[PDB]
Design a protein around this ligand. Structure first.
Ligand SMILES: C[C@H](O)CCCC(=O)CCC/C=C/c1cc(O)cc(O)c1
Ligand SMILES: C[C@H](O)CCCC(=O)CCC/C=C/c1cc(O)cc(O)c1
Ligand SMILES: [K+]
Ligand SMILES: [K+]
Lengths: 267, 266
């Protein structure tokens, strides 16, 4: 496993990890931007004959050395441009991509905006609606935000409390710092940027969409409706918002099988 | 509120309730077949200018005087035929219908099978897949079944435990007796009978489909997919499997507003 940093012309110094040889699979984090959440799955996926790349997102965790524009007023389209920049730096020309949450928005924007670069995209629980209770955290003090959102992550959306806690002190200390950054740059601007207003643009695209099996129906109801309207493959993963944490083996198998499906269809 | 009984020539003596005057709205119970779950909402809906009818289902609660075939090997098509028989007996010629669970299967079967009789149907959380863990309760002893399913209702799918408990001791005593009847006669045969194999048959029909907002996505995921494929209105009610128990005012409002929408359209 390569663990290193790389700087892109847009001023971001990325922390990234890479393991394996074979077709490229890129795991884009959710809004918290923390790629250690992929640790177990990276090895399982790479072992099936893929080169797997992941990274902390700009302004978050180990990728914090970045211009303020990259973690304020954040949109799917901004994030997609940043991901393209690190793929360029790493000489990854053709990638399968995964993303959850703002990462889901990002990978659909990637697929639509850079079709020559993206073999297929897997999106999970893509936020399309403004949620005032999240947006309103942005005006609180840093420690108040971190306390509130740490609680929300563990109790409301982790999909597995034991697994979430078992990420450990080092990861959670990084998440603690990230929560105010996410709170002030994401909730207000990510949902209106969702690249799913044009249903016909999605039709026929190599997109595989999932929602958590245990997630309350109302949370990503709109995803299921939108995917079905566009004829896009839609299904479920165990857990809720973080299947790569709660169910890393099932997650890895899904990513491998889905990538294999598209490698067959490509030929 | 009229509370009475009526006997249909298929051998069922129904317990039923009616309140109000105006267009007919009929509330079909879920598989537990217990119409006291509608008590609050019946009054609220009727007050908006409707005649509201509901009833215990065959073999359940106060409608227990019924032949074994009406509560064993139960299908959506069987239940639809029974509901038509009581509508006939009460001289209800054109009805808006609500149903959840097996009641949802029933009202879709009613709409498709008897389009002249059904103004519009509201279906909620319609089961289309066999669940082994539910089917397997059919071979346990009665008291084992009641203990298991009473817990599942209270703690897993009620959508509001306080409201569920507040149905009261008499209701839960009736449910206690119903759980084994439901276990033996419904889970194994209701889902394969789901009238949703033909999406094109649903298209353009006066159907409004809901799922509980708090229900785990995987429970009625298929409902949302099927409704969307057919272009059928699909949305959410608060709670889970029993919105008429957990959120009776919201439930009543939904039934009234949906009926009014279709009265305008017609
Ligand atoms: C992991 C996630 O990317 C960031 C933490 C917030 C969270 O998990 C809440 C549940 C999912 C909501 C995502 C969401 C919701 C919004 O209204 C706006 C937005 O930008 C993202
Ligand atoms: C109230 C409900 O009508 C009867 C109690 C069982 C329950 O609530 C479990 C959750 C919803 C499942 C209904 C269901 C599931 C099946 O596999 C087969 C079937 O016939 C009905
Ligand atoms: K697993
Ligand atoms: K209510």
């Amino acid at each position: 496993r390569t663990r290193s940093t790389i700087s892109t012309p847009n001023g971001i110094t990325w922390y990234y990890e890479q393991e394996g040889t074979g077709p490229d699979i890129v795991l884009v984090p959710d809004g918290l931007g923390e790629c250690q959440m992929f640790d177990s799955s990276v090895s399982q996926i790479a072992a099936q004959g893929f080169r797997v790349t992941t990274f902390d997102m700009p302004g978050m965790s180990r990728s914090a050395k970045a211009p303020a524009e990259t973690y304020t007023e954040v949109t799917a389209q901004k994030l997609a441009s940043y991901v393209i920049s690190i793929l360029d730096a790493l000489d990854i020309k053709h990638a399968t991509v995964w993303g959850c949450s703002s990462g889901a928005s990002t990978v659909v924007a990637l697929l639509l905006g850079y079709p020559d670069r993206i073999r297929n995209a897997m999106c999970h629980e893509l936020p399309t609606k403004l949620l005032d209770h999240l947006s309103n955290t942005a005006v609180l003090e840093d420690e108040e935000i971190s306390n509130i959102l740490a609680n929300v992550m563990l109790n409301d959306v982790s999909g597995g409390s034991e697994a979430w806690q078992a990420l450990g002190v080092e990861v959670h200390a990084r998440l603690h710092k990230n929560y105010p950054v996410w709170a002030r740059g994401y909730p207000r601007t990510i949902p209106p940027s969702a690249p799913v207003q044009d249903v016909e643009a999605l039709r026929g695209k190599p997109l595989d969409w999932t929602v958590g099996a245990a997630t309350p129906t109302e949370s990503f109801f709109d995803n299921i409706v939108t995917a079905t309207k566009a004829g896009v493959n839609i299904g479920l993963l165990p857990g809720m918002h973080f299947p790569y944490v709660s169910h890393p083996d099932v997650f890895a198998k899904y990513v491998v099988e889905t990538t294999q499906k598209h490698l067959w269809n490509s030929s």
